[PDB]
């Protein structure tokens, strides 16, 4: 359902052989800053006439090897031709280069072979329906048929608004203009109305065989300079405001593709969210490619493809089609802001709530305070299932770790029925179906602390029944507690928790106020306590997060 299928880059700079799936809206990010920039340049060379005329240098070839040929192919999908207007744009120019047998697909390729004597390898653009017999894109002079289809707008991080406005002023009443024109000449008559015009001529005439020297603008009219005025960081957003209005009117007849590199540069965090809303929520930017290091620039992300360039020197690329389902729509904004910062990390530990974050932040601080520097990240997920977070992180090649409590949820409208919520979420990551809800018989005289302890006994009983299902969880880096985190914490530092709280049952007291008591616990936690919790088998997720 997207015109842009995938792009292939062969032997171009650090790209040995890289295949990346695509969509209308694409966002690229990762550690390799060189790979992200070369990715945008590889798209410009294929589609931007100004950057393509310069040809390939020796450095652009992969590993500076001129024998290997540079090849950049863009695969397109024309299946939605019946209801896509921009698809008909491409068809009208391609004409007979398509075949009816493969009418759904169309290829746009860039081939380059290097000449030693000419010290210069030219760029030959081919297209066609079949990848085997691509034909040269027809052209006459400095323009070809491809330049009539696609117009590439590259938004530099740093831009002067007055300079770009001078480019758009020309194309963007008459009886009124005539009065302004005659009045413009009225300026020059009053300016001359005098001692300098006559003395510079007497000096010029003796020097060289009328020197009036009027004033600019009045010669060419008021339209020559019409720079804007509002009523550094603020004017950057007005340049985007010009781009939206300009490109639609100027390039309505062709497909416009935006290449936005690092737009968060010299931009406030609040404006980054404003730009993110305009990129995804608004239909103003139909097709763009975005390179960003800013998590706040993805707060409003939806219906986009996320491309992650790996930190390795091989320049491996992992792409994910990020789409928020309608069921998650009521918590979409909360979910995106938490996941946006996790895309840039290397290992993400899925925790439930803030009480786990308060504990883990203190424990990690004593054991390994540089865990975020090396790519670790604590992502808290509350109320929702793990599938949306795991699918996005898995496709992007990000190591995901899950630590959740074994919980039971009472079904509404019926008493005595409890859903196996803790197991179902871990089973959902493995693709298995939700387990049947169970009914446990608790007497009416058993309430409060006595009631909770009996429910814990069912959790331990349920945990033992699915002993093999837990075995599959550990292979998938899923860590399901027997009862909950507080009981696993008691197993690691029971002597410390009893001394810290002086209460004979520290687990019961910790769960009274989970946030406050966890803060009270971490304040009195010893350094050996943090190492004991870290080294304990029940907390293997902390060892997997640091990556030892």
């Amino acid at each position: 359902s997207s015109k842009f299928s995938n792009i292939t880059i062969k032997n171009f700079r650090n790209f040995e052989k890289v295949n990346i799936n695509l969509d209308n809206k694409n966002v690229i990010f990762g550690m390799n800053d060189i790979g992200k920039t070369n990715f945008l340049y590889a798209l410009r060379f294929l589609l931007d006439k100004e950057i393509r005329k310069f040809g390939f240098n020796k450095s652009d070839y992969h590993k500076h090897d001129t024998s290997k040929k540079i090849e950049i192919i863009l695969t397109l999908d024309l299946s939605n031709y019946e209801k896509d207007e921009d698809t008909k744009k491409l068809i009208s120019v391609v004409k007979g280069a398509r075949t009816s047998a493969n009418a759904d697909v169309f290829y746009i390729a860039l081939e380059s072979k290097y000449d030693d004597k000419e010290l210069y390898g030219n760029i030959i653009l081919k297209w066609g329906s079949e990848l085997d017999n691509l034909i040269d894109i027809p052209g006459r002079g400095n323009i070809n048929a491809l330049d009539n289809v696609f117009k590439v707008i590259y938004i530099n991080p740093l831009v002067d608004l007055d300079k770009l406005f001078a480019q758009n002023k020309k194309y963007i009443d008459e009886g009124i203009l005539n009065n302004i024109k005659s009045l413009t000449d009225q300026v020059n008559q009053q300016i001359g109305e005098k001692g300098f015009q006559q003395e510079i001529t007497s000096e010029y005439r003796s020097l060289k065989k009328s020197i009036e020297l009027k004033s600019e603008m009045a010669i060419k009219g008021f339209f020559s300079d019409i720079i804007p005025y509002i009523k550094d960081g603020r004017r950057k957003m007005l340049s985007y405001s010009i781009y939206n209005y300009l490109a639609k009117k100027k390039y309505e007849d062709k497909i416009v593709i935006y290449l936005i590199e690092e737009p968060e540069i010299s931009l406030h965090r609040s404006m980054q969210i404003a730009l993110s809303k305009q990129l995804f929520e608004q239909s103003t930017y139909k097709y763009f490619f975005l390179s960003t290091h800013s998590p706040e620039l993805l707060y409003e992300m939806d219906n986009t493809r996320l491309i992650r360039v790996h930190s390795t020197e091989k320049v491996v690329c992992s792409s994910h089609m990020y789409n928020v389902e309608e069921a998650y729509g009521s918590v979409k904004k909360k979910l995106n802001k938490a996941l946006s910062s996790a895309l840039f990390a290397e290992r993400v530990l899925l925790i439930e709530g803030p009480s786990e974050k308060i504990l883990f932040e203190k424990v990690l601080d004593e054991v390994e305070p540089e865990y975020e520097l090396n790519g670790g990240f604590l992502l808290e997920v509350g109320g929702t299932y793990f599938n949306h977070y795991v699918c996005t992180l898995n496709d992007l090649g990000i190591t995901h770790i899950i630590k959740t409590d074994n919980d039971l949820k009472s079904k509404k409208g019926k008493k005595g029925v409890y859903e196996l919520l803790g197991l179902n979420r871990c089973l959902n990551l493995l693709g298995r179906e939700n387990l049947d809800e169970i009914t446990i018989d608790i007497p009416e005289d058993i309430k409060g602390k006595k009631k909770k302890e009996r429910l814990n006994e069912r959790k331990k009983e349920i945990f033992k029944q699915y002993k093999n299902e837990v075995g599959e969880f550990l292979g998938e880096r899923i860590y399901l507690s027997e009862i909950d985190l507080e009981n696993d914490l008691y197993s690691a530092i029971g002597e410390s928790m009893k001394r810290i709280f002086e209460n004979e049952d520290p687990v019961h007291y910790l769960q009274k106020s989970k946030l406050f008591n966890m803060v009270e616990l971490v304040n009195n936690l010893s350094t050996k306590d943090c190492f004991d919790v870290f080294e304990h088998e029940k907390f293997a997720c902390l060892k997997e997060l640091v990556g030892s």
């Binding site: 004409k95 398509r98 009418a103």
Partner: protein
Amino acid sequence: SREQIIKDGGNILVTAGAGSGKTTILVSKIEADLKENKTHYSIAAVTFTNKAAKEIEGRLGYSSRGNFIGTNDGFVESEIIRPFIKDAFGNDYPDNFTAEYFDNQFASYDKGLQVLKYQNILGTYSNPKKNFKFQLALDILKKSLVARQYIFSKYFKIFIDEYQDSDKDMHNLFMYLKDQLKIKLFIVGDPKQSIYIWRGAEPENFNGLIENSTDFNKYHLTSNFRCCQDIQNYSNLFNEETRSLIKEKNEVQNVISIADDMPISDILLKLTEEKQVLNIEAELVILVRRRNQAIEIMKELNEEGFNFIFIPQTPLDRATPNATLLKEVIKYVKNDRYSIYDLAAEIVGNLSSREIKEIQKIINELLVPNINQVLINQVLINLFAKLEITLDTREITAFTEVMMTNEFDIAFDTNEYLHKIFTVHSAKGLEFNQVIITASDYNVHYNRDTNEHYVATTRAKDKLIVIMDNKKYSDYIETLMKELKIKNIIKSI
């Protein structure tokens, strides 16, 4: 009226007549739709002759929309047949084919495919009523999916000129684009049988659309659209059918009547200097019935300093099927600056460079001087034999007579003169800015010369000057002004 015509954005069927009303409205309708539509879709205008396509392209201006302006044959060739013939029929068929109109006539559609597949040329059908190129183009569209996708993606509306000359195979393709591909069609044609038809013309397909088509929106064009309202009122009052369309105006200024009391040259000086109702810098032309009446007026004005050149009606100036083409052959023979490409542009279809060289060889026999009447007739038959057009006996003698003498040279001269005098039959076609006529020429009581008078009145564009030589002429005006209760229809000096 015309404002109601251009506003319609759907399928438009236009009935055009009297000439030039079709071309000006077509160019204005095209450039107006280009301004309204900002999307990537383009328009396509098709004309039978290459001159009409070049005439439309010059008035439109820049075609940065990718709009196609060309010949009917060149359209289906460059947009349908050549791009998608290999998709429709396989890789066996060539896309570098060369279409020759005169050579390689065949009997069956299967035979022509072999000429294109093996002999690498696109030949015409032997039957004039059946078109092979349009039968091939329609067949290619049905066979090729990409061909249908490209036509829909490229053009949103198609303009067609002189639709009454379109054959049935040519008509089937246009209806296929409207019915199946849902492409808007702007159709311009003449419902009257007239004199000029393309060799495979069938007026019934055009007439059938006027009668039974619910999709098209029918419109009509005024015959004297270019003439001003005052001249239209004076012209339409002489014929009963035309008296109903004109509407009275409170003030009449364009039509001037002056009784001829002073000599002819003095009336010209009186209108030019004493009242200044005629400008000497604007083109002025005078109407006569016979050649002798023009000679005596031309000679009388040479004595008074007035300089004039008089165009006489040629033997070819006659309503015949090949009159228009025969005159162009004379213009190529008489004038050296008239190129052979200008002559080929008048020929129907987009002739190839090789076919142009063969036609040029036949006509080069007429460029030698003093080769008598017999050889002119054979060159003419040889010329029209290639075009598969028979020639009327009187058309041959009319062509021959013009070739012998230099008497009718300026009538076919490429140069243009400001002040002229023409006969009513001399410029039955072309229109002039300001015209002066005399009343004694036309018998108005018995309507013998009312048709020649109506033509005389419709030639003037801005200002018409009538001399009231005949009392019976003025009586017919005053009598009908009382029947219609018209106080003023004429401005008298």
